[PDB]
Design a protein around this ligand. Structure first.
Ligand SMILES: [Cu+2]
Ligand SMILES: [Cu+2]
Lengths: 128, 128
């Protein structure tokens, strides 16, 4: 912990946390995502994407349209604050981002953009 | 209609109906399944599988273990009353089964066995 969090996406399309707090003293913050299940990336791939709560739906919709090869994210989507790659069973990936890109008193959501998964795989992130 | 129903499973991992009623006047019943989305079968394939409610979990778990080559269904699973093939985008399939294989007073469930889909892709079938 301290400026990092570990999250897992499983074969039941669930993240193992639904809320992340980012300490305002952290200059940067790292998310370490792993996949503890046994299903492959094409069937049950997961990623972790951060946007404002207001931008989440447009990022999910355009992520689906980008497809498979683009890790279901529109390239250079300006609304994505940070995101991982899409990972399969047994993989891991991290993203570190600057905490100065987050405002106090704004609502953020993290979610997975694999088709259909965001209904279940989503949570809030807040500065503290 | 009445002795047949048209169902579709889309890219949002949902069926367009979650309850089917089979009139006891029907000697046979036909299910026509289509996939109106753009995702491929190995990423978002769908099938329509019928069993008793009590047998659904076992069918889904064993189905998952059989893999894509088996259309995610255990070969000659006696718990499956009827099923289609697994189809991808723009495909369709149809299956007809005998209504006397259903009895009144028993709870039946139709569902998709592609990994993870049955959490949302399921519904009741009732003989009325
Ligand atoms: Cu996911
Ligand atoms: Cu399905």
């Amino acid at each position: 912990a301290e400026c990092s969090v570990d999250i897992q996406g499983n074969d039941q399309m669930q993240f193992n946390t639904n809320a992340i707090t980012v300490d305002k003293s952290c200059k940067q913050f790292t998310v370490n995502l792993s996949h503890p299940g046994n299903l492959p990336k094409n069937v049950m791939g997961h990623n972790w994407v951060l946007s404002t709560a207001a931008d989440m739906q447009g990022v999910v919709t355009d992520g689906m349209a980008s497809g498979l090869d683009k890790d279901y994210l529109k390239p250079d989507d300006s609304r994505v604050i940070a995101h991982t790659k899409l990972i399969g069973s047994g993989e891991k990936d991290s993203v570190t981002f600057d905490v100065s890109k987050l405002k106090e008193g704004e609502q953020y959501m993290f979610f997975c953009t694999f088709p259909g998964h965001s209904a279940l795989m989503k949570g809030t992130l807040t500065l503290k």
